[PDB]
Amino acid sequence: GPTPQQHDGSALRIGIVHARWNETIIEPLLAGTKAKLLACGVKESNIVVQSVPGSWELPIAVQRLYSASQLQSTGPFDALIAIGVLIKGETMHFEYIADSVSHGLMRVQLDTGVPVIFGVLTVLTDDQAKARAGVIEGSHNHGEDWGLAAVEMGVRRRDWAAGKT
Amino acid sequence: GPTPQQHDGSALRIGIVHARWNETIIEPLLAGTKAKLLACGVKESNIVVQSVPGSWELPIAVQRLYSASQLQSTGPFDALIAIGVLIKGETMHFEYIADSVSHGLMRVQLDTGVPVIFGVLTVLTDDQAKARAGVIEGSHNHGEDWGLAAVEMGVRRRDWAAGKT
Amino acid sequence: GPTPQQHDGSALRIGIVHARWNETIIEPLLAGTKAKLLACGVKESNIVVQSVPGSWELPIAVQRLYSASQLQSTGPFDALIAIGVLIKGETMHFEYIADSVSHGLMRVQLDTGVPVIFGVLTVLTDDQAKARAGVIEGSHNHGEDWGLAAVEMGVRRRDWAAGKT
Amino acid sequence: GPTPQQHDGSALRIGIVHARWNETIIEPLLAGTKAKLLACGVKESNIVVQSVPGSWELPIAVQRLYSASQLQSTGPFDALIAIGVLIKGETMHFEYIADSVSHGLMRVQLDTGVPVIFGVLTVLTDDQAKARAGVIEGSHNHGEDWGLAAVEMGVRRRDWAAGKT
Amino acid sequence: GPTPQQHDGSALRIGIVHARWNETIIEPLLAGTKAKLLACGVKESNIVVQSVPGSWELPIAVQRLYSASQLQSTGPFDALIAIGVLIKGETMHFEYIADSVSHGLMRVQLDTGVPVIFGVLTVLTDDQAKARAGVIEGSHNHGEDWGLAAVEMGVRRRDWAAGKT
Numbered sequence: 028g029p030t031p032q033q034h035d036g037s038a039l040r041i042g043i044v045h046a047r048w049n050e051t052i053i054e055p056l057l058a059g060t061k062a063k064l065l066a067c068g069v070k071e072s073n074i075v076v077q078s079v080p081g082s083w084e085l086p087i088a089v090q091r092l093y094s095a096s097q098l099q100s101t102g103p104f105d106a107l108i109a110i111g112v113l114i115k116g117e118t119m120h121f122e123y124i125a126d127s128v129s130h131g132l133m134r135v136q137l138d139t140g141v142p143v144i145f146g147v148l149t150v151l152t153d154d155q156a157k158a159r160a161g162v163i164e165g166s167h168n169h170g171e172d173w174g175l176a177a178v179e180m181g182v183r184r185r186d187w188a189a190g191k192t
Numbered sequence: 193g194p195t196p197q198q199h200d201g202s203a204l205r206i207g208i209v210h211a212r213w214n215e216t217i218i219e220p221l222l223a224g225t226k227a228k229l230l231a232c233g234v235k236e237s238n239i240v241v242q243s244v245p246g247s248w249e250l251p252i253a254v255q256r257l258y259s260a261s262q263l264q265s266t267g268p269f270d271a272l273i274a275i276g277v278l279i280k281g282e283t284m285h286f287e288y289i290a291d292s293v294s295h296g297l298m299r300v301q302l303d304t305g306v307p308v309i310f311g312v313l314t315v316l317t318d319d320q321a322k323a324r325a326g327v328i329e330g331s332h333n334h335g336e337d338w339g340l341a342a343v344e345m346g347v348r349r350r351d352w353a354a355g356k357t
Numbered sequence: 358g359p360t361p362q363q364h365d366g367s368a369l370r371i372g373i374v375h376a377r378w379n380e381t382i383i384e385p386l387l388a389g390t391k392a393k394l395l396a397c398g399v400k401e402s403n404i405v406v407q408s409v410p411g412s413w414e415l416p417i418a419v420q421r422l423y424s425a426s427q428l429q430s431t432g433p434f435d436a437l438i439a440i441g442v443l444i445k446g447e448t449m450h451f452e453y454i455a456d457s458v459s460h461g462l463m464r465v466q467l468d469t470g471v472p473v474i475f476g477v478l479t480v481l482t483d484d485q486a487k488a489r490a491g492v493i494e495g496s497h498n499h500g501e502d503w504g505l506a507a508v509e510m511g512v513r514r515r516d517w518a519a520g521k522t
Numbered sequence: 523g524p525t526p527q528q529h530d531g532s533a534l535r536i537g538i539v540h541a542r543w544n545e546t547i548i549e550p551l552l553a554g555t556k557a558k559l560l561a562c563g564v565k566e567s568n569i570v571v572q573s574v575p576g577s578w579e580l581p582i583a584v585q586r587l588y589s590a591s592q593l594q595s596t597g598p599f600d601a602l603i604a605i606g607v608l609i610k611g612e613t614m615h616f617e618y619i620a621d622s623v624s625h626g627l628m629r630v631q632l633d634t635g636v637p638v639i640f641g642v643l644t645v646l647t648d649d650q651a652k653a654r655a656g657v658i659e660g661s662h663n664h665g666e667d668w669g670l671a672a673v674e675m676g677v678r679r680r681d682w683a684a685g686k687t
Numbered sequence: 688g689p690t691p692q693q694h695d696g697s698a699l700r701i702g703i704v705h706a707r708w709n710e711t712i713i714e715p716l717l718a719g720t721k722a723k724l725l726a727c728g729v730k731e732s733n734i735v736v737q738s739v740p741g742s743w744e745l746p747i748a749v750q751r752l753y754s755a756s757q758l759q760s761t762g763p764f765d766a767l768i769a770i771g772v773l774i775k776g777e778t779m780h781f782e783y784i785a786d787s788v789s790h791g792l793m794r795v796q797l798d799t800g801v802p803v804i805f806g807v808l809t810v811l812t813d814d815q816a817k818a819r820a821g822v823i824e825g826s827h828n829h830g831e832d833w834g835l836a837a838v839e840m841g842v843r844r845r846d847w848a849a850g851k852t
């Protein structure tokens with residue numbers, strides 16, 4: 028378990044990209060993460076949320092979303108969140124996508140210099156996904172953690188960008 | 193399971209590179225993906241389709257195909273699709289190629305800033321390949337998913353390129 | 358087991374970023390690493406210590422922390438330390454994060470040309486974490502090793518930067 | 523199994539780098555790949571063949587070989603082939619080298635924009651190597667596949683370089 | 688088993704970086720590699736040897752060592768050797784470090800365009816390390832192989848740098 032921390036992040040602009048596989052799990056997740064964002068003061072209008080078919084699209088989509096925000100409510104995002112739900116199938120498809128999407132996101136992060144919250148679940152059974160999405164009774168929705176983290180990192184990124192230590 | 197979406201993508205130019213190992217599986221896949229492309233309004237003439245011997249050639253081939261479209265019916269592709277079929281052999285050849293082709297494609301994607309649909313199957317038995325290719329009675333051809341995704345991502349890439357969020 | 362070596366590093370400026378998951382393990386670790394830093398003559402004021410929620414944030418945070426020190430007590434850090442504690446859960450989350458955070462740090466290191474001490478534990482049970490953190494009576498705290506290493510590498514980085522061999 | 527295709531590639535210049543571990547397997551392989559090259563019209567003088575001690579040297583060697591051809595019978599190679607034979611030992615040495623050599627080659631390929639045929643065997647037993655090298659009576663020599671692929675890709679690379687689609 | 692080859696490499700300048708974990712294994716290794724270097728005509732004064740605490744430091748240290756030699760007995764090294772000894776512990780620490788150090792070295796190699804001999808042992812038991820270090824009676828020291836390879840690659844690098852094929 029982690030240690031909770033709520034930051035201002037009211038001057039933050041967050042970008043979220045979620046995949047659409049396993050939507051019944053994606054929604055609960057997205058809901059929780061968006062919730063905590065507002066809960067932290069992020070303005071509803073400063074939260075961009077786009078989707079893609081699968082997790083594989085996550086990294087490319089996040090890279091481009093940010094890319095767009097730069098060409099420009101307005102202003103390059105201060106933090107990004109990638110939400111996806113991978114579940115083991117009968118083949119190794121699961122593992123090859125999980126590993127690449129993982130490194131992919133880690134890259135976009137370091138490449139871009141902008142925090143990309145890892146909101147991707149790499150589960151083995153449906154129930155595990157549900158449990159991590161808060162779907163099950165008294166189960167902790169990790170989305171909340173991700174929104175919370177997005178804000179913290181967004182704030183931190185700014186300070187670093189300001190040369191503050 | 194995912195949640196498809198049909199987008200316009202009639203102003204899209206899609207590039208497809210498929211390997212030739214396990215052609216009886218490649219064809220059904222390619223067929224389905226090309227089908228859904230047209231089904232989305234992609235003009236037959238705006239769908240380029242080239243092949244390579246194995247999956248290892250997929251990433252290099254995709255990188256160069258796009259590269260070519262840039263030097264130029266005409267205009268850099270808006271989305272790319274890599275189709276390959278890896279099946280476990282007796283050695284670790286399967287895993288070393290799958291992992292590299294996977295990262296390879298993920299890279300070309302991020303490098304190029306152009307979505308590259310992951311149409312590569314990493315299966316353990318022939319039947320699994322067939323099932324994923326729609327070959328087996330009342331099975332689902334994933335190719336359809338890939339064509340569908342190619343369009344969506346192509347459209348999305350354009351908007352991002354336009355700084356739209 | 359390694360061979361101990363204490364260097365001057367009194368003219369060193371060290372940056373430390375630690376995650377907050379498993380704080381009861383993080384603290385003992387951080388404590389030991391900071392201890393050995395001072396023990397080597399690093400001035401208390403030349404030791405910057407910031408935190409992040411999870412290990413995933415480690416690489417991005419380290420990259421940016423250093424980045425900031427460059428824009429500028431003052432002067433780009435001579436060495437960095439990433440402290441995190443991953444513990445196997447019920448899913449593959451553990452492994453996908455460990456592998457990416459690992460490569461992520463290795464990258465920031467080579468990218469930046471600045472040593473980033475790998476103070477991340479990839480454990481299977483709570484006790485293992487405690488044992489590596491010196492928590493368990495008469496056990497060895499690896500944090501000490503990391504602080505010690507941070508100094509050595511910091512010193513070495515400088516010489517290399519000076520073209521000395 | 524793949525689908526055979528013989529291309530011209532008489533105007534091609536191919537570079538081959540093979541390791542020397544397990545030479546009794548390397549030779550049969552190299553022989554077959556060189557054979558099919560000529561068989562496709564590649565001029566004997568346009569086939570450069572150098573060696574290195576182990577597979578680890580493969581990627582660096584291929585990168586530099588091509589690099590050299592650029593500084594310049596003459597003309598940067600149109601395709602490269604890396605031949606190596608890894609066999610599981612008692613330790614994890616096998617896997618750590620196979621994975622790095624694999625990504626290494628995939629990188630040189632994408633980096634360089636030149637196809638690098640993956641002629642590396644990642645086997646578990648001597649016999650498997652022999653079988654893949656055509657050594658074991660009636661077994662298939664994969665080298666033939668690699669030479670064949672080198673030509674196709676070489677030809678294709680040229681067209682892409684010409685902006686042809 | 689590999690095929691032996693002794694080259695001149697008397698005009699070579701070799702840089703060696705070894706970790707200090709498991710020194711009783713590192714020393715025998717380093718000894719053997721340095722031995723074969725001299726045995727090949729490398730001048731004692733042209734062999735630089737620095738150390739680092741663990742294997743994780745290997746890639747960064749090698750990258751910087753070379754880096755230094757460039758700013759400049761004198762002259763950028765023609766080949767580099769990384770010596771480290773990883774042994775499975777109770778946790779996954781072993782695997783996460785081995786995989787990153789491996790890719791790290793492979794990268795410095797391709798990045799730098801200078802061969803970096805992989806003198807890192809990824810063993811499961813102390814005895815395996817000893818056996819690979821020639822320690823056990825009548826056991827073959829791999830260090831000899833590495834020194835030998837360093838020379839060959841150094842010589843080859845030069846020729847490639849000279850555009851020779």
Ligand SMILES: O=Nc1c(NC[C@H](O)[C@H](O)[C@H](O)CO)[nH]c(=O)[nH]c1=O
Pocket residue numbers: 046047048080081082083084111112113114115120124308309310311338341
């Ligand atoms: O297939 N299983 C999954 C999946 N599809 C793979 C991929 O994201 C993509 O849609 C196409 O491969 C090519 O772009 N995506 C997930 O988020 N979870 C899964 O469990």
Ligand SMILES: O=Nc1c(NC[C@H](O)[C@H](O)[C@H](O)CO)[nH]c(=O)[nH]c1=O
Pocket residue numbers: 211212213245246247248249276277278279280285289638639640641668671
């Ligand atoms: O070997 N099995 C397979 C394969 N060949 C490997 C590779 O693509 C290539 O042709 C050469 O290795 C070197 O370029 N390619 C596949 O698409 N599926 C397989 O199941």
Ligand SMILES: O=Nc1c(NC[C@H](O)[C@H](O)[C@H](O)CO)[nH]c(=O)[nH]c1=O
Pocket residue numbers: 143144145146173176376378410411412413414441442443444445450454
């Ligand atoms: O989940 N378990 C762990 C964890 N959280 C994962 C991650 O670091 C992050 O906080 C979010 O995934 C997205 O940024 N972080 C750890 O350091 N150890 C764990 O054992």
Ligand SMILES: O=Nc1c(NC[C@H](O)[C@H](O)[C@H](O)CO)[nH]c(=O)[nH]c1=O
Pocket residue numbers: 541542543575576577578579606607608609610615619803804805806833836
């Ligand atoms: O060790 N076994 C093998 C090997 N040597 C490892 C490596 O390529 C290298 O020579 C040195 O590690 C450092 O450069 N190389 C192979 O192609 N196959 C093997 O089965």
Ligand SMILES: O=Nc1c(NC[C@H](O)[C@H](O)[C@H](O)CO)[nH]c(=O)[nH]c1=O
Pocket residue numbers: 473474475476503506706707708740741742743744771772773774775780784
């Ligand atoms: O821990 N075991 C080992 C080790 N230490 C890990 C690492 O190299 C480093 O010193 C610190 O983690 C952070 O920089 N280094 C080795 O070469 N072999 C081991 O068997």
